[PDB]
């Protein structure tokens, strides 16, 4: 099973094991299952992450301009700021998605995508 | 040394010269320390302060 | 005189109470800030690791890694507190900043200020030195957003707009609880550190270029966190010193007030018995 | 000023102003130290400490106690030195450089030694 850890710059955000991880890197969409070759990539500005947690349901995360690393030991998602699907404010994300600012608009669109649109 | 020890009690760092002075002063103070009813002849004091 | 002494002994007691409270609150906030500093260590370590891998795979021609041909200006990010009672914290930071400015002039570089914290703004405004940009109100509780903004401004100045050909950061490193030392680090251009001895998407040149600004941002964030921890430690030390000084001043004023109390009693008795002897 | 001259009077009164402001701050300096003062008072306090230590002199009668020979400072040199100190032309030297020194030449000599 994958050792999936999501590390925000301020703090470590999540550390549960998973069977499958999914995200849109800058050069296309990618999925990682255990024993994937080492990799480094940049998640799209409005990226989202799906972690197929083995025990419970999958975890959908809105990620802000994060980086993805795959290693023989663990799968790391470095994050500037991220939110689990349960913590997303749907109305706030909808409002931000129309924001003029590129960063705010991208973050809101990422929140919408993680939530389930 | 007394003044510098008062200063350094709360300073964040001590320079090489300051630390050397503090170390010398601590040993000088410990050297002047003397037990009661144990006076020292003047030559013994000369050697001790030396 | 006795009334003045008792009023002063009242003030000193109130000040002792306030400074002891501040010392204990600083002891708590030191723990909080140190916990935050540790909490950001994983991201710093992992981003540094992937940065080393990309640099191994990169060309190493990014602007942040190559010295400018002729350095004219050198930005300096001075990280200072925003509230007083922090002892010589701000003084040490600004002394190191001035030493850095002298070194820069000896190298021909013209320093240009970016200042974090209100106190450094006052220090530099008194000395008629212009701060291009200043950020305030988060030295106690820095977030990653403030570090992102600071790093973005610094990197934009470095790339450029008059711009700067180099940039340093002066801040109080939190070496240990007892000791916190003002240090200056050149945050750009970064030295390539070859040492004895993966896949990349898109190619390692673009990924490395998009990662390096993030590295500068995380290093600035770590600097801000460590400066906050050092500020809290310096506040603890300064408030312990203030409490000790207030206690010593209370003792001195109490000894005095006792002396004038006894002297007033004596003088009153002298007057009374002088009147008695004459009558 | 009618007797000692306007220069002497001005320097003396500026020194007195600096020392009086230092005395007024003394109560705060006792608790918190110079680090809490404003930067116009911090500068004033630094040069006030230097003025206070410069008023000291290696007296000729003090040789029997210290061994250091005495020094005499002419009035014009004293006025010049304190005019400089009040204007901040010496506020970068260490304070001990002004201690029991007696003059500007000796001030420079001791500064070096430190």
| CA-based torsion, D19, D24, D27, D32: positive or negative | negative
Q: Extract the tokens encoding C47.
A: 């981003």
Report in angstroms the alpha-carbon separations of A36 from A4, A25, D23, D109.
12, 16, 74, 73
Residue D90 three-state SS: coil
Q: Closest Cα to residue A65, out of A96, A88, A43?
A: A43
Q: What is the DSSP letter of A14?
A: E
Q: Closest Cα to residue D30, out of C249, A45, C23?
A: C249
Q: Extract the tokens encoding D59.
A: 């007296």
Contact D111, D92 (CB under 8 A): no
Q: Extract the tokens encoding A57.
A: 């349901």
d(CA C78, CA C75): 10
Domains of chain A from N-terminus onward:
2-115 (2.60.15.10)
Q: Which helix (H) or strand (E) holds A109?
A: helix A102-115
Q: Extract the tokens encoding A64.
A: 């802000």
Return the number of other C-beta atoms located less than 10 Å from residue C145's C-beta.
13
Return the number of other C-beta atoms located less than 10 Å from residue D110's C-beta.
19
* Residue C268 within a domain: no
Q: Extract the tokens encoding D99.
A: 């201690």
d(CA C279, CA C267): 18
d(CA C56, CA A64): 26
Domain that residue C41 falls in: 21-237
Return the number of other C-beta atoms located less than 10 Å from residue C103's C-beta.
14
Question: Biggest alpha carbon distance in chain B?
Answer: 43
Question: Contact C249/D33, CB-based, under 8 Å?
Answer: no
Helices within chain C (DSSP H only): 2-39, 41-57, 89-106, 118-126, 144-159, 204-278
* Residue C278 within a domain: no
Q: Which helix (H) or strand (E) holds D109?
A: helix D105-113
Contact C150, C116 (CB under 8 A): yes
Q: Extract the tokens encoding A41.
A: 């990539």
Q: What is the 3-class SS of chain B, one letter each residue?
A: CHHHHHHHCCCCCCCHHHHHHHHHHHHHHHHHCCCCCCCCCHHHHHHHHC
Residue D45, phi then psi, degrees to nearest 5: -70, -40
d(CA B21, CA B24): 5
* Residue C276 within a domain: no
d(CA C43, CA A77): 9
Question: Contact D31/C242, CB-based, under 8 Å?
Answer: yes
The two beta strands, A2-8 and A12-14, are antiparallel
Which of the residues B5, B8, B10 would you substitute to probe the C interface, choosing the one with the greatest number of C C-beta atoms within 10 Å?
B10
Contact A67, A40 (CB under 8 A): yes
Give the contacts of C266 (CB within 8 A, at least 6 positions apart): none
Domains of chain D from N-terminus onward:
6-113 (1.10.1140.10)
d(CA B1, CA A50): 65
Chain C residues in contact with D39 (beta carbon < 8 A): 122-123, 126
How big is chain D, counted in residues? Answer: 114
Q: Extract the tokens encoding C20.
A: 């002891």
Q: Which helix (H) or strand (E) holds D29?
A: helix D6-31
Q: What is the total count of domains within chain C?
A: 1
Which of the residues C39, C42, C55 would you substitute to probe the A interface, choosing the one with the greatest number of A C-beta atoms within 10 Å?
C42
CA–centroid distance for D52 within its chain: 5
- Side-chain-side CA neighbours of residue D78 (13 Å): 15
Chain C residues in contact with A40 (beta carbon < 8 A): 50, 53-54, 198-201, 204, 207
Contact D107, D80 (CB under 8 A): no
Residue C176 three-state SS: coil
Residue in C with minimal Cα distance to D33:
C87
d(CA D62, CA D73): 16
Report in angstroms the alpha-carbon separations of A108 from A90, A105, C147.
9, 5, 21
Burial class (CB in 10 A: 0-12, 13-18, 19+), C43: buried
d(CA C119, CA D39): 10
Q: Closest Cα to residue C74, out of C95, C100, C41?
A: C100
Radius of gyration for chain C, computed over Cα atoms and rounded to the nearest angstrom: 27
* Residue C138 within a domain: yes
Q: Closest Cα to residue A39, out of A60, A62, A7, A70?
A: A70
Return the number of other C-beta atoms located less than 10 Å from residue C68's C-beta.
15
* Residue C5 within a domain: no
Beta bridge partners of A32: A21
Give the resolution in Å: 2.6
Q: What is the 3-class SS of C85-140, one letter each residue?
A: CCCCHHHHHHHHHHHHHHHHHHCCCEEEEEEECHHHHHHHHHCCCCEEEEECCCCC
What is the CATH classification number for the domain harbouring C169? 3.40.1380.10
Of C19, C91, C245, the CB nearest to D30: C245
Question: Contact C242/D32, CB-based, under 8 Å?
Answer: yes
Beta bridge partners of A61: A49, A84
d(CA A94, CA B47): 87
Peptide bond into C202 cis (omega under 30): yes
d(CA A41, CA C50): 10
Q: What is the DSSP letter of A69?
A: E
Give the contacts of C122 (CB within 8 A, at least 6 positions apart): D38, D39
Report in angstroms the alpha-carbon separations of C75 from C61, C114, C129.
21, 7, 13
Vertex C23, ends C5 and C142: CA angle to 5°? Answer: 135
Given a contact as 3+ CB pairs under 8 Å, which chains touch D? C
Residue in D with minimal Cα distance to C91:
D35
Question: Contact B10/C241, CB-based, under 8 Å?
Answer: yes
Which of the residues C81, C177, C179, C248 would you substitute to probe the B interface, choosing the one with the greatest number of B C-beta atoms within 10 Å?
C179
Buried b (16+ CB within 10 A) or exposed e, C159-175: eeeeebbbbbbbbbbbe
Given the structure tokens 């972690």, which residue do they identify? A51
Contact A27, C201 (CB under 8 A): yes
Peptide bond into C189 cis (omega under 30): yes
Beta bridge partners of C182: C172
* Residue C84 within a domain: yes
d(CA C10, CA C212): 57
* Residue C1 within a domain: no
How determined?
cryo-EM
Question: Contact B12/C179, CB-based, under 8 Å?
Answer: yes
Q: Closest Cα to residue C148, out of C74, C200, C222?
A: C222
Report in angstroms the alpha-carbon separations of A24 from A66, A117, C207.
11, 16, 15
Chains B and A touch (3+ CB pairs under 8 A): no
List, edge to edge, every strand of the sheet that includes A82-84. A28-32, A21-25, A48-51, A59-63, A82-84
d(CA C230, CA B16): 22
Q: Closest Cα to residue C234, out of C91, C78, C36, C38?
A: C91
Given the structure tokens 């966190």, which residue do they identify? C225
Residue in C with minimal Cα distance to A75:
C46
d(CA D71, CA D58): 6
Of A10, A28, A30, the CB nearest to C144: A10
d(CA C119, CA D9): 37
Residue C171 three-state SS: strand
Question: Biggest alpha carbon distance in chain C?
Answer: 112
Residue A56 three-state SS: coil
Give the contacts of A33 (CB within 8 A, at least 6 positions apart): A2, A19, A20, A21
Return the number of other C-beta atoms located less than 10 Å from residue C231's C-beta.
32
B13 touches chain C (CB under 8 A): yes
d(CA C188, CA C170): 13
Give the contacts of C58 (CB within 8 A, at least 6 positions apart): C204, C205, C208
Q: Extract the tokens encoding C58.
A: 């990169």
Residue in C with minimal Cα distance to B12:
C179
Give the contacts of C5 (CB within 8 A, at least 6 positions apart): C253, C256, C257, C260
Residue A42, phi then psi, degrees to nearest 5: -115, 120
Given the structure tokens 């973005």, which residue do they identify? C152
Which of the residues B6, B7, B8, B12 would you substitute to probe the C interface, choosing the one with the greatest number of C C-beta atoms within 10 Å?
B12
The two beta strands, A67-70 and A39-42, are antiparallel
Beta bridge partners of A79: A8
Residue A112 three-state SS: helix
How distant is the Cα of C97 from the closest Cα of chain D, in angstroms?
A: 16
* Residue C9 within a domain: no
For A84-87, the CB contacts below 8 A with 24+ separation are: A84/A14, A84/A59, A84/A60, A85/A59, A85/A60, A85/A61, A85/A114, A85/A115, A85/A116
Chains B and C touch (3+ CB pairs under 8 A): yes
């Amino acid at each position: 099973d994958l050792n999936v850890e999501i590390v925000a710059v301020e703090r470590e955000l999540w550390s549960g094991p998973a069977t499958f991880v999914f995200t849109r890197t800058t050069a296309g969409e990618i999925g990682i299952l255990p024993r994937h070759i080492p990799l480094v990539a940049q998640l799209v500005d409005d990226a989202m992450v799906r972690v197929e947690r083995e025990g419970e349901d999958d975890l959908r995360i809105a990620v802000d301009g994060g980086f993805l690393s795959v290693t023989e030991e663990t799968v790391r998602i470095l994050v500037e700021n991220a939110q689990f699907e349960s913590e997303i404010d749907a109305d706030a994300a909808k409002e931000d998605a129309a924001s003029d600012d590129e960063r705010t608009a991208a973050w809101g669109r990422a929140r919408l995508r993680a939530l389930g649109q | 040394y007394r003044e510098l020890e008062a200063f350094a009690a709360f300073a964040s760092d001590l320079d090489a010269a300051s630390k050397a002075q503090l170390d010398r002063g601590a040993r000088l103070v410990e050297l002047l320390k003397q037990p009661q009813y144990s006076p020292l002849a003047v030559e013994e004091q000369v050697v001790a302060i030396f | 005189t006795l009334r003045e002494l008792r009023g002063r002994i009242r003030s000193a007691g109130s000040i002792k109470k306030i400074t002891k409270a501040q010392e204990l609150i600083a002891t708590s906030r030191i723990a909080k800030a140190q916990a935050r500093v540790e909490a950001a260590r994983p991201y710093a370590a992992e981003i540094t690791n992937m940065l080393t891998e990309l640099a191994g795979a990169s060309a190493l021609d990014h602007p942040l890694l190559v010295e400018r041909k002729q350095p004219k200006r050198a930005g300096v990010l001075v990280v200072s507190s925003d509230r007083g009672l922090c002892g010589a914290y701000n003084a040490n930071v600004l002394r190191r900043a001035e030493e850095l400015f002298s070194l820069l002039r000896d190298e021909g570089k013209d320093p240009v200020l970016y200042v974090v914290g209100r106190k450094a703004l006052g220090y530099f405004s008194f000395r008629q030195r212009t701060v291009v940009e200043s950020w305030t109100g988060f030295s106690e509780r820095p977030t990653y957003e403030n570090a992102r903004e600071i790093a973005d401004t610094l990197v934009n100045a470095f790339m450029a707009i008059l711009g700067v050909d180099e940039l340093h950061i002066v801040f109080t490193e939190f070496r240990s609880m007892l000791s916190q030392t003002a240090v200056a680090r050149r945050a750009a251009p970064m030295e390539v550190e070859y040492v004895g001895e993966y896949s990349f998407e898109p190619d390692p040149e673009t990924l490395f270029d998009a990662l390096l600004p993030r590295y500068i941002a995380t290093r600035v964030y770590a600097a801000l966190l460590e400066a906050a921890a050092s500020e809290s430690a310096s506040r603890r030390r300064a408030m312990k010193s203030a409490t000790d000084n207030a206690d010593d001043l209370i003792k001195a004023l109490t000894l005095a007030a006792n002396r004038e109390r006894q002297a007033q009693i004596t003088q009153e008795i002298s007057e009374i018995v002088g009147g008695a002897n004459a009558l | 000023p009618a007797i000692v001259g306007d220069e002497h009077y001005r320097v003396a009164q500026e020194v007195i102003r600096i020392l009086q402001r230092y005395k007024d701050l003394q109560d705060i300096i006792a608790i918190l130290g110079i680090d809490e003062l404003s930067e116009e008072d911090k500068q004033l306090v630094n040069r006030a400490r230097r003025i206070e230590r410069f008023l000291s002199q290696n007296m000729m009668a003090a040789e029997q106690f210290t061994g250091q020979p005495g020094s005499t400072v002419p009035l014009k040199e004293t006025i010049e030195a304190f005019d400089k100190l009040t204007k901040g032309e010496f506020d970068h030297l260490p304070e001990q450089a002004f201690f029991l020194i007696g003059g500007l030449d000796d001030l420079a000599k001791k500064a070096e030694s430190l």
